[model samples]
Target: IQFKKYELPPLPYKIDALEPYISKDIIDVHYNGHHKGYVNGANSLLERLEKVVKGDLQTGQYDIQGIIRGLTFNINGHKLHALYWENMAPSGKGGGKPGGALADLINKQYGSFDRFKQVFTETANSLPGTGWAVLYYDTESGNLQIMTFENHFQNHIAEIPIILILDEFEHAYYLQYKNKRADYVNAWWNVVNWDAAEKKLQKYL
Candidate 1:
């Protein structure tokens, strides 16, 4: 059987839409370079696995564990990057406190929106290496949780739906914020798409 290839999802906004906060140059490079790289990497791994399955290639010719590991990284990278793009809007349309069901959930879980924001920001800032800061909807516990993922794969819980995502990788902010990751994290709040996040959370609810 042929495995379907994963395609890079289109950016939700123009390259320059998040400008000043996230520079056009950075978005261009991050989307076309890093995000696309993961998409291609995932497809390449799938192709190899298909070849082995179809008998054109021998299983011993490749390291199966390595291929699975690489596939996990690449596929997760692609999925997270897509979520990251959708979780923000242009500055004017983006930042503000969330409203409705999502707002209530945030308040109920964290005591207040400000408190939740503070904790999420700290979680993003505390990342010692390349990774992501995600807002998760825990399916079993039915709670809102903030978590981090290392290199797109590690530290992620199974079966939880990501409600929001922040790319903390240097490629996400180095060109714009330089070494001040806190500054980048703060600036990112201005573009968060609360509506998009609410929609994702609504699905799990």
Candidate 2:
């Protein structure tokens, strides 16, 4: 009864698919380099944990606290990155005015999609450092709320499922947009997979 080695999931669309807005160079390096690094780190930690559990490795070899914290970081990166890829679509096919109940709901709550973007933008820009701006389904209130938090771990107490995730780490956009992070943030709307978001919203409703 040991855990499995993690593998990097394939991108939902081709790496070069997000052109004009998110450059090919950024996506290529971000996915293959950064995202894959987390997967490997997490899997490596899990393997070691399994070995320690099975008494194959000495307990002193790993600091339990460090292992636990590192695992949280890597696994959080993996999970959030996985969702991030799916929550976007290639240009043209995705990113535009949304439809269905999700649109109606956003309108109902925030007045309009423009308003939603305003708040989302504010949250995205306000993150002090490497983090994510996420749109999460508030399970307690049965509404959608925007959360801006550093690092990758999901909000355990909130129990809110993420509908859309925007990575604010420099690695996510530095290559393409340089220090113009707000540009990257705005351009992201051009590739947002609103339909995928709506699908997630369906489960909550």
Candidates' lDDT values, in order? 0.91, 0.87
Per-residue alpha-carbon lDDT of candidate 2 for residues 106-128, written as tens digits (9 for 90 to 100): 89899999998899898889888
- Candidate 2 vs. true structure, TM-score: 0.94
- Which residue pairs overlap in candidate 2's backbone? none
What is the model-wide C-alpha lDDT for candidate 2? 0.87
Model 2 misplaced regions, further than 4 Å: 154-157
Using lDDT as the measure, which candidate wins?
Answer: 1
Question: Per-residue alpha-carbon lDDT of model 1 for 121-181, expressed as tens digits?
Answer: 9888888799999888888988888998888899998987888899988899998788888
lDDT of 1: 0.91
- Predicted candidate 1, C-alpha RMSD: 1.0
TM-scores for every predicted model: 0.97, 0.94
